[PDB]
Design an enzyme around this catalytic site. Structure first.
Site, short mmCIF file in Angstrom:
data_model
loop_
_atom_site.label_atom_id
_atom_site.label_comp_id
_atom_site.label_asym_id
_atom_site.label_seq_id
_atom_site.Cartn_x
_atom_site.Cartn_y
_atom_site.Cartn_z
N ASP A 1 0.00 -7.73 1.46
CA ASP A 1 0.56 -6.33 1.90
C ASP A 1 2.09 -6.23 1.73
O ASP A 1 2.46 -5.98 2.53
CB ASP A 1 -0.15 -5.75 3.14
CG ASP A 1 0.30 -4.44 3.55
OD1 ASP A 1 0.92 -3.36 1.58
OD2 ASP A 1 -0.44 -3.73 3.75
N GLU B 1 24.28 8.55 6.53
CA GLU B 1 23.21 7.90 6.19
C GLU B 1 23.02 8.25 4.92
O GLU B 1 23.29 8.88 3.81
CB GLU B 1 21.62 9.04 6.75
CG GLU B 1 21.66 9.37 7.69
CD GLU B 1 19.93 10.13 8.25
OE1 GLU B 1 19.73 10.77 6.95
OE2 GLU B 1 19.84 10.82 9.47
N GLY C 1 1.71 5.07 13.52
CA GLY C 1 3.51 5.84 13.79
C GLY C 1 4.24 5.11 12.58
O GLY C 1 4.98 5.51 12.39
N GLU D 1 19.13 5.62 8.77
CA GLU D 1 18.80 6.61 9.11
C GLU D 1 18.49 6.63 10.36
O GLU D 1 18.31 5.17 10.92
CB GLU D 1 17.60 6.65 7.98
CG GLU D 1 17.10 8.26 8.63
CD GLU D 1 16.26 8.25 8.35
OE1 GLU D 1 15.55 8.57 7.85
OE2 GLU D 1 15.80 10.39 7.76
N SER E 1 4.32 2.24 10.02
CA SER E 1 3.68 1.57 7.86
C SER E 1 5.06 1.00 7.41
O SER E 1 5.96 1.30 7.31
CB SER E 1 3.60 2.75 7.58
OG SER E 1 2.82 2.47 6.57
N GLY E 2 5.16 -0.22 7.65
CA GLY E 2 5.54 -1.56 6.23
C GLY E 2 7.01 -1.92 7.27
O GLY E 2 8.09 -2.06 6.97
N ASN F 1 17.81 9.97 12.21
CA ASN F 1 17.30 10.69 12.71
C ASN F 1 15.92 11.52 11.21
O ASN F 1 16.82 11.76 10.71
CB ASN F 1 17.76 11.98 13.20
CG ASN F 1 16.89 12.88 13.82
OD1 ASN F 1 16.03 13.31 12.90
ND2 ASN F 1 17.21 13.57 15.01
N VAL G 1 17.54 15.01 11.22
CA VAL G 1 19.13 15.37 11.18
C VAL G 1 19.70 15.17 10.85
O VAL G 1 19.33 13.29 10.69
CB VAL G 1 19.09 15.56 13.01
CG1 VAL G 1 20.58 16.58 12.90
CG2 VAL G 1 18.08 17.01 13.77
N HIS H 1 0.89 -1.41 0.15
CA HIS H 1 -0.11 0.14 0.07
C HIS H 1 0.99 1.04 0.01
O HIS H 1 0.45 2.36 -0.49
CB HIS H 1 -1.11 -0.26 1.06
CG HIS H 1 -0.08 -0.77 2.61
ND1 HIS H 1 -0.46 -0.67 3.48
CD2 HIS H 1 0.64 0.97 3.32
CE1 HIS H 1 0.44 -0.42 4.27
NE2 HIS H 1 0.72 0.54 4.68
#
Ligand SMILES: *[C@@H]1O[C@H](CO)[C@@H](O[C@@H]2O[C@H](CO)[C@@H](O[C@@H]3O[C@H](CO)[C@@H](O)[C@H](O[C@H]4O[C@H](CO)[C@@H](O)[C@H](O)[C@@H]4O)[C@@H]3O)[C@H](O)[C@H]2NC(C)=O)[C@H](O)[C@H]1NC(C)=O
Ligand SMILES: *[C@@H]1O[C@H](CO)[C@@H](O[C@@H]2O[C@H](CO)[C@@H](O[C@@H]3O[C@H](CO[C@H]4O[C@H](CO)[C@@H](O)[C@H](O)[C@@H]4O)[C@@H](O)[C@H](O)[C@@H]3O)[C@H](O)[C@H]2NC(C)=O)[C@H](O)[C@H]1NC(C)=O
Ligand SMILES: *[C@@H]1O[C@H](CO)[C@@H](O[C@@H]2O[C@H](CO)[C@@H](O[C@@H]3O[C@H](CO[C@H]4O[C@H](CO)[C@@H](O)[C@H](O)[C@@H]4O)[C@@H](O)[C@H](O)[C@@H]3O)[C@H](O)[C@H]2NC(C)=O)[C@H](O)[C@H]1NC(C)=O
Ligand SMILES: *[C@@H]1O[C@H](CO)[C@@H](O[C@@H]2O[C@H](CO)[C@@H](O[C@@H]3O[C@H](CO)[C@@H](O)[C@H](O)[C@@H]3O)[C@H](O)[C@H]2NC(C)=O)[C@H](O)[C@H]1NC(C)=O
Ligand SMILES: *[C@@H]1O[C@H](CO)[C@@H](O[C@@H]2O[C@H](CO)[C@@H](O[C@@H]3O[C@H](CO)[C@@H](O)[C@H](O)[C@@H]3O)[C@H](O)[C@H]2NC(C)=O)[C@H](O)[C@H]1NC(C)=O
Ligand SMILES: *[C@@H]1O[C@H](CO)[C@@H](O[C@@H]2O[C@H](CO)[C@@H](O[C@@H]3O[C@H](CO)[C@@H](O)[C@H](O)[C@@H]3O)[C@H](O)[C@H]2NC(C)=O)[C@H](O)[C@H]1NC(C)=O
Ligand SMILES: *[C@@H]1O[C@H](CO)[C@@H](O[C@@H]2O[C@H](CO)[C@@H](O[C@@H]3O[C@H](CO)[C@@H](O)[C@H](O)[C@@H]3O)[C@H](O)[C@H]2NC(C)=O)[C@H](O)[C@H]1NC(C)=O
Ligand SMILES: *[C@@H]1O[C@H](CO)[C@@H](O[C@@H]2O[C@H](CO)[C@@H](O[C@@H]3O[C@H](CO)[C@@H](O)[C@H](O)[C@@H]3O)[C@H](O)[C@H]2NC(C)=O)[C@H](O)[C@H]1NC(C)=O
Ligand SMILES: *[C@@H]1O[C@H](CO)[C@@H](O[C@@H]2O[C@H](CO)[C@@H](O[C@@H]3O[C@H](CO)[C@@H](O)[C@H](O)[C@@H]3O)[C@H](O)[C@H]2NC(C)=O)[C@H](O)[C@H]1NC(C)=O
Ligand SMILES: *[C@@H]1O[C@H](CO)[C@@H](O[C@@H]2O[C@H](CO[C@@H]3O[C@H](CO)[C@@H](O)[C@H](O)[C@@H]3O)[C@@H](O)[C@H](O)[C@H]2NC(C)=O)[C@H](O)[C@H]1NC(C)=O
Ligand SMILES: *[C@@H]1O[C@H](CO)[C@@H](O[C@@H]2O[C@H](CO)[C@@H](O)[C@H](O)[C@H]2NC(C)=O)[C@H](O)[C@H]1NC(C)=O
Ligand SMILES: *[C@@H]1O[C@H](CO)[C@@H](O[C@@H]2O[C@H](CO)[C@@H](O)[C@H](O)[C@H]2NC(C)=O)[C@H](O)[C@H]1NC(C)=O
Ligand code: NAG
Ligand code: NAG
Ligand code: NAG
Ligand code: NAG
Lengths: 232, 235, 603
Positions: free
Chosen positions: A92, A70, A183, A60, A185-186, A62, A65, A48
């Site tokens: 999904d 990263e 908060g 990553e 997702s995936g 932050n 920041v 999705h």
């Protein structure tokens, strides 16, 4: 009888959740979905989360920041599962191919694909930028974690009748309160050091006695291997 | 947390880090060859399984645990002061026993306990240590920070923070204009005062109200009155 | 003429312009060749400019499925003041394909629409210029091709009925998406993402086959404002009633409002609803005023994820609004925070009451509970908790056991997490059990035993005046400060050497104990080895020699015998005369003396 409908989730801030090289994030101007890194070019993410332009951030820590550790590689090709059902959120899972090969270091690495199906009660770790706050809106910008043992198939099916299949399992025995502010997702789901699944959806942000739903990837291991072979 | 600075190698040999589950959760101080002194608040609720606590002695950088000067050790026995309350935040000092022992070296040294009837006068600058943050929350620093802050008398401390009991079991350190504090973020070490020509375990990092905020004293656990309790377990 | 990177020359090779300017609708080349159809060889249909009133176009690979990524652009030009309506019958593709409709031509375009994998329906552009950008972002066999049928219409003679009424089946009808919004409305067939948030079916059609508009369903984490604008309405001699259906389902629904705006700058709000109203389509009724030209808007504020707001079935009529048959919507009941505070429950119990659930141990325990259990026993009897079953969370839920009868309670043990736990022994005849709970993940609880008796945790003392260590092992004489490991506690090896009448903490006279009697020592000869042995026995650091003052004591002195292994041998035989008191002097162990050359930072 006025109400406010607010709560909080158990603290999982940790030490900013470092030493997690298998955690990656998808960016399209802001953080919207997570994912896991399986090789130098392919990642695993929920179906999705498909968007026209997605930027993959490696290692990553932050989201706002930049610490200089990263890796930013733009997405080149995104493939979604042909049997994905938007109404039921079944199958999904999708694969995103990095334009350039990733650099493996202490903060960016890969996690081996699972070889056995998950078992009930197996300890699992979920990584993602969850919404943890004491009160109000204080969403953090640091990686977090939360343990979540696998529940029984019958309980998972009875929890959400008509929306649970053999490819789905509950988060855990955690009630999760009444935060109702998702908060994650995936987010990768790792059990015994193997990526057993990804975060798909749930009834809110793990409402009380109603845990969320994760997409099992053991049945999709063959599909992932075939996709990698066809698009090597 | 604001106020941190660079720390030289071997500057604070008695500052050690405590890892629980793979993350730096709290700090401790090296007093003897087999015991450590840490805050009881940060180790509360995790004393049933001492094997999950990792004691890193001589740590200097968060992501540089490879130098031979650092000798990791495990914890087998955890003891919490019976006078701890967890509601008034009184007497938040606990001791942790090392696995077997630690060999003394240049970068790993013990710290002298305060003697009987030895009170550091208020207003004397003392050093602080810990792996705190630059901002109030988040962005943890990978380098040990050090700062100097004079002690604050409890008579003004109880008035500047009218939310606790303070009493004579706490030592407060802070500034009128703020800027330097170590109460929140991460303890990562105790409060150290030096007189004559040697440092002492004057205080242990404790709770606080705010970081780098004026009229917000930083609370530290008093060790002068707890010398006997520590020495009972040192030998 | 050479051009810098990122720019391309014209056909005449006289002026360098930006690469994006070519085939964009803006004439920048002196000869005007940048807009030539042959030059803009999209290969899709061989044509680039459509100056006719109506027409259609095809895409690359008309007879066979496409296999290569080709970029195609089309521009349609009509008379000034006229608008172009784009109608689509059925569009499908392999995910990565966007038509990229834009408002106008050149650099003034921002965005008009972007539909992929689904039929756009009908798209109307209120401008004389319409631009599309065909893109392929995959190397797989995508769809065969794209076509669009369009017809020119005046768009200013439309009455209020056509402008306002829209059931969301022929696209967005004549509604114009606002260009001053954080995000645009999305028309998605059937149910969308964020389960338990957003409609699962269309109101007009009744099932998933219909189409409805709503806030963006992407899993974002930022607050955004969305808005929809309508054409100005001509003045009318009769008041009109505005009807629409709104579906505000989600725990994070912020606000939905209309905010009618007029040419007189007297903007006002005629409709405003906040909060969740359940998974049901509610009816909105609005009366009209402001005969002067005005625009009807739908300003919706979008919160973080799970804050979807949807609108459907917009219609207009005339006359005073009738009585609303549909009842006025009400907010969801919401789980009430009925002041958790402190449940308390049972406080004190005696010997007859032993077995008890914590609060509701068979099921769970309430959140934010601070339960105090006062275990009172008879005088002289200890209390053994003897936990039966224990299932807490992990590090948050903690059971605290203390010792009572005094203001300064003494902590005994802290238990947390799943699995059985050991018993607790209290020093006196009072035990306090404290349960600290959290607001999340409240397990079943714990159950106790409340066992009381005499010397529950105190082992039986040894007989025949034999010393006993903490572990209970019998130590009559073997390990009385002799330097062994009979008991792991080490109490049997307590320091039998200490100072007496000294000047400071690290100073004193000779005081050595063999088994149970303290006595002085003989130090007629003193060396470094004996001083080091005394320092080691006293637990101090490196020491040095000392000298006596005056023989003021003539008691039972015991000579000191040294060994090469460092062990001290005590011989209770005073084979000497004129014994003198000996001062014991040693220094403390080396503490944390600073060694690094720390710099000075006057900041
Ligand atoms: C329809 O949309 C328009 C545009 O988005 C919107 O206009 C804006 O309204 C807000 C508040 O209604 C205005 O913000 C105000 O600015 C003034 C001057 O800076 C402040 O004094 C205001 O503070 C007080 O405002 C109220 C008194 O009028 C008090 O009741 C309130 O408690 C505050 O103390 C306030 O900040 C903003 O300037 C306009 N923007 C414009 C005019 O461009 C309008 O409100 C929306 N709703 C309608 C028209 O019904
Ligand atoms: C605008 O919204 C209104 C809702 O409040 C709708 O109803 C009326 O609108 C008018 C003007 O917009 C309001 O202003 C008042 O109008 C009266 C009308 O006076 C009439 O009666 C007197 C005495 O018999 C007569 O002399 C006049 O010629 C009129 O025939 C004025 O007298 C007032 O001073 C004031 O301006 C009304 O308050 C308002 N309500 C009512 C009950 O009238 C209106 O329909 C909307 N406009 C549209 C739809 O075009
Ligand atoms: C621990 O176990 C105890 C078992 O003995 C529980 O005691 C029970 O307590 C309840 C409530 O008090 C009793 O129910 C009623 O008690 C009243 C008490 O009367 C009082 O007042 C009269 C006035 O003349 C006085 O004479 C009495 O001595 C009392 O001071 C009775 O009058 C009623 O008839 C009725 O019995 C139970 O009877 C009592 N026993 C049992 C077996 O339930 C105690 O509640 C337990 N602890 C907790 C926290 O529940
Ligand atoms: C930490 O301190 C202890 C105590 O001093 C050290 O143990 C001691 O280490 C030395 C040197 O390795 C040993 O001396 C040698 O022992 C071997 C047998 O292992 C023997 O064959 C040699 O002839 C020589 O004597 C010593 O025996 C050993 N134990 C004691 C009681 O001194 C330990 O090495 C130190 N560890 C570190 C990392 O510094
Ligand atoms: C204990 O620490 C405090 C700081 O926390 C020390 O106060 C500092 O005292 C020095 C004086 O030696 C001040 O330096 C001054 O700076 C001005 C700037 O223009 C300059 O003009 C003066 O000539 C002087 O050099 C410094 O500003 C001041 N710190 C603060 C924050 O005001 C104090 O001296 C220390 N006491 C002991 C006994 O170590
Ligand atoms: C599209 O339709 C609109 C109608 O909404 C046309 O606008 C109308 O154009 C006529 C001209 O044929 C205007 O009539 C003139 O108005 C002026 C005042 O501005 C007056 O002085 C003249 O005597 C004449 O009556 C009319 O006002 C104007 N607006 C409306 C609401 O009717 C527009 O021209 C059409 N565009 C085309 C056909 O390309
Ligand atoms: C409010 O309800 C009415 C009734 O459903 C809606 O339409 C009304 O339809 C009737 C039938 O054509 C119109 O004529 C009226 O018929 C009745 C019964 O024969 C007669 O008693 C009246 O004198 C009148 O001739 C009527 O004008 C029309 N409107 C009203 C207000 O009744 C109407 O569309 C609904 N909505 C609004 C905003 O009025
Ligand atoms: C803690 O509570 C449990 C039950 O809630 C107590 O377990 C019970 O302990 C009694 C003895 O105090 C047992 O009775 C004896 O059992 C043995 C067999 O184990 C039998 O040979 C004797 O003749 C006598 O019947 C009882 O069976 C046992 N029940 C269960 C279910 O285990 C336990 O004693 C309590 N702990 C204390 C009081 O310290
Ligand atoms: C020998 O043991 C005695 C037991 O305390 C100590 O002897 C005397 O200790 C005093 C300390 O107050 C010394 O005074 C000062 O010592 C420092 C060195 O610590 C020196 O730099 C000063 O100039 C001053 O003398 C005193 O000298 C010392 N006397 C002797 C004969 O030692 C001391 O702990 C031990 N002595 C040594 C040298 O370690
Ligand atoms: C789901 O929603 C659609 C929306 O269109 C519903 O379609 C309705 O279909 C009926 C069918 O009536 C006839 O069907 C013939 C084909 O068997 C067809 O040739 C004929 O022209 C006529 O349409 C139609 O009467 C309704 O008007 C349609 N609904 C609408 C809103 O127009 C469909 O029934 C719904 N349910 C399912 C299970 O698909
Ligand atoms: C810390 O708590 C103690 C609790 O005893 C406070 O003692 C109070 O002292 C005043 C002065 O006589 C009495 O009137 C109160 O009744 C005492 N409290 C209680 C609960 O009895 C003491 O004041 C507190 N310290 C501070 C700084 O607030
Ligand atoms: C107590 O403070 C003095 C400060 O002078 C320390 O240093 C002594 O400095 C003198 C300089 O005249 C030297 O001659 C001494 O050797 C230094 N050491 C001693 C022990 O006298 C002194 O070191 C401090 N005490 C300690 C713990 O050593
Ligand atoms: C960091 O680790 C490297 C390992 O090669 C070592 O050489 C260096 O001295 C270490 N630095 C510090 C400050 O510990
Ligand atoms: C695009 O092509 C498909 C397949 O021929 C067709 O159904 C559709 O009508 C065409 N486009 C439009 C405007 O409908
Ligand atoms: C303490 O002083 C008395 C005074 O005679 C002395 O006799 C005694 O020996 C002293 N201390 C010791 C360690 O014996
Ligand atoms: C010192 O005196 C003791 C007393 O018996 C004796 O055992 C020891 O050998 C003497 N030390 C010498 C002679 O070096």
């Amino acid at each position: 009888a006025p109400f406010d409908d607010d709560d909080k989730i158990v603290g999982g801030y940790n030490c900013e959740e470092n030493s997690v090289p298998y955690q990656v994030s998808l960016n399209s101007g802001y953080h919207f979905c997570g994912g896991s890194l399986i090789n130098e070019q392919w990642v695993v993410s929920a179906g999705h989360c498909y968007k026209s332009r997605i930027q993959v951030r490696l290692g990553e820590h932050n989201i706002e920041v930049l610490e200089g550790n990263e890796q930013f590689i733009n997405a080149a090709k995104i493939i979604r599962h042909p049997q994905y059902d938007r109404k039921t959120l079944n199958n999904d899972i999708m694969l995103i191919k990095l334009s350039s090969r990733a650099v493996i270091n202490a903060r960016v690495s890969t996690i081996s694909l699972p070889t056995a199906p998950p078992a009930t009660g197996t300890k699992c770790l979920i990584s993602g930028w969850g919404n943890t706050a004491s009160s109000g809106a204080d969403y953090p910008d640091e990686l977090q974690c939360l343990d979540a043992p696998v529940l029984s198939q019958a309980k998972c099916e009875a929890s959400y009748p008509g929306k649970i299949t053999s490819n789905m399992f509950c988060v855990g025995f955690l009630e999760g309160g009444k935060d109702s502010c998702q908060g994650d997702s995936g987010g990768p789901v790792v059990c015994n050091g193997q990526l057993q699944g990804v975060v798909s959806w749930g009834d809110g942000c793990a409402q009380k006695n109603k845990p969320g739903v994760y997409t099992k990837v053991y049945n999709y291991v063959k599909w992932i291997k075939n996709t990698i072979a066809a698009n090597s | 947390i604001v106020g941190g600075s660079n720390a030289k190698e071997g500057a604070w040999p008695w500052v050690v880090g405590l890892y629980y589950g793979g993350r730096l959760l709290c700090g401790a101080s090296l007093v003897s060859s087999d015991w450590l002194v840490s805050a009881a608040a940060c180790v509360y609720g995790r004393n049933l399984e001492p094997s999950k606590w990792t004691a890193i002695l001589g740590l200097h950088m968060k992501s540089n645990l490879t130098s031979p000067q650092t000798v990791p050790r495990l914890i087998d026995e955890i003891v919490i002061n019976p006078h701890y309350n967890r509601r008034r935040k009184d007497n938040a000092i606990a001791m942790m026993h090392l696995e077997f022992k630690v060999n003394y070296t240049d970068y790993i040294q013990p710290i002298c306990l305060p003697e009987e009837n030895q009170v550091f006068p208020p207003g004397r600058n003392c050093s602080i240590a810990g792996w705190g943050t630059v901002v109030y929350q988040g962005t943890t620093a990978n380098i040990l920070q050090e700062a100097d802050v004079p002690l604050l008398s409890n008579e003004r401390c109880q008035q500047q923070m009218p939310e606790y009991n303070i009493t004579e079991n706490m030592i407060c350190a802070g500034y009128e204009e703020g800027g330097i504090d170590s109460c929140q973020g991460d303890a990562g070490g105790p409060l150290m005062c030096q007189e004559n020509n040697r440092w002492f375990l004057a205080g242990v990092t404790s709770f606080g109200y705010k970081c780098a905020l004026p009229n917000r004293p930083g609370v530290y656990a008093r060790v002068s009155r707890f010398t006997e309790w520590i020495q009972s377990f040192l030998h | 003429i050479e051009c810098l990177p990122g720019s391309s020359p014209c056909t005449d090779a006289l002026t360098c312009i930006k690469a994006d300017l070519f085939c964009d609708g803006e004439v920048n080349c002196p000869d005007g060749s940048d807009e030539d159809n042959k030059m803009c060889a999209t290969v899709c249909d061989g044509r680039f400019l459509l100056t006719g009133s109506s027409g259609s176009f095809q895409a690359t690979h008309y007879p066979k499925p496409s296999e290569t990524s080709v970029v195609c652009q089309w521009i349609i030009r009509v008379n000034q003041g006229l608008s172009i309506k784009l109608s689509f019958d059925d569009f499908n593709t392999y995910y990565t394909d966007i038509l990229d409709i834009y408002e106008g031509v050149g650099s003034s375009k921002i965005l008009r629409a972007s539909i992929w994998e689904t039929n756009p329906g009908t798209i109307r552009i209120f401008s004389n210029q319409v631009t599309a950008t065909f893109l392929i972002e995959s190397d797989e066999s995508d769809y065969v091709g794209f076509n669009a049928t369009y017809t020119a219409f005046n768009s200013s003679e439309l009455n209020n009925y056509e402008k306002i009424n829209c059931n969301f089946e022929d696209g967005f009808c004549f509604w114009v998406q606002d260009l001053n919004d954080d995000n645009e409305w999305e028309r998605i067939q059937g149910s969308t993402f964020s389960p338990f948030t957003g409609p699962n079916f269309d109101h007009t059609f009744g099932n998933a086959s219909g189409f409805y508009i709503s806030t963006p369903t992407g899993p974002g984490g930022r607050q955004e404002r969305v808005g929809l604008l309508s054409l100005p309405l001509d003045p009318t001699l009769e008041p009109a009633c505005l009807s629409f259906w709104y579906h505000m389902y989600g725990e994070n629904v912020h606000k939905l409002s209309i905010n009618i705006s007029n040419d007189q700058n007297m903007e006002k709000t005629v409709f405003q609803k906040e909060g969740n109203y359940g998974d049901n389509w509610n009816y909105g009724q609005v009366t009209l005023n402001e005969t002067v030209k005005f625009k009807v808007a739908f300003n919706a504020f979008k919160n973080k994820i799970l804050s979807d707001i949807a609108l459907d079935d917009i219609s207009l009529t005339y006359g005073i609004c009738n009585g609303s048959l549909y009842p006025e919507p009400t907010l969801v009941p919401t789980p009430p925070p009925e002041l958790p505070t402190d449940c308390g429950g049972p406080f004190e119990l005696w010997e007859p009451n032993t077995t008890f659930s914590s609060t509701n141990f068979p099921n769970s325990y309430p959140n934010l509970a601070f339960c105090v259990w006062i275990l009172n026993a008879q005088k002289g009897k200890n209390i053994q908790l003897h936990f039966q079953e224990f299932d807490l969370e992990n590090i948050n839920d903690v059971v605290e056991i203390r010792d009572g009868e005094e203001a300064d309670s003494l902590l005994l043990a802290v238990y947390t997490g799943p699995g059985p736990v050991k018993d607790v022994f209290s020093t006196t005849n009072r035990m306090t059990v404290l349960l600290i709970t959290n607001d999340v993940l409240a397990r079943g609880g714990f159950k106790a035993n409340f066992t009381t008796g005499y010397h529950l945790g105190i082992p039986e003392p040894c007989k025949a005046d034999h010393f006993q260590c903490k572990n209970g092992e019998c130590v009559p004489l073997v390990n009385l400060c002799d330097g062994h490991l009979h008991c792991e506690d080490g109490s049997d090896e307590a320091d039998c050497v200490r100072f007496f009448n000294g000047t400071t903490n690290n100073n004193g006279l000779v005081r050595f104990r063999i088994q149970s009697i303290w006595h002085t020592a003989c130090a007629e000869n003193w060396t470094t080895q004996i001083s080091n042995d005394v320092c080691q026995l006293l637990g101090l650091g490196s020491g040095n020699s000392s000298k006596p003052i005056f023989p003021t004591d003539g008691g039972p002195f015991v000579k000191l015998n040294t060994a090469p292994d460092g062990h001290l041998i005590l011989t209770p035989s005073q084979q000497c005369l004129q014994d003198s008191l000996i001062r014991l002097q040693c220094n403390h162990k080396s503490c944390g003396k600073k060694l690094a050359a720390q710099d000075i930072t006057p900041k």
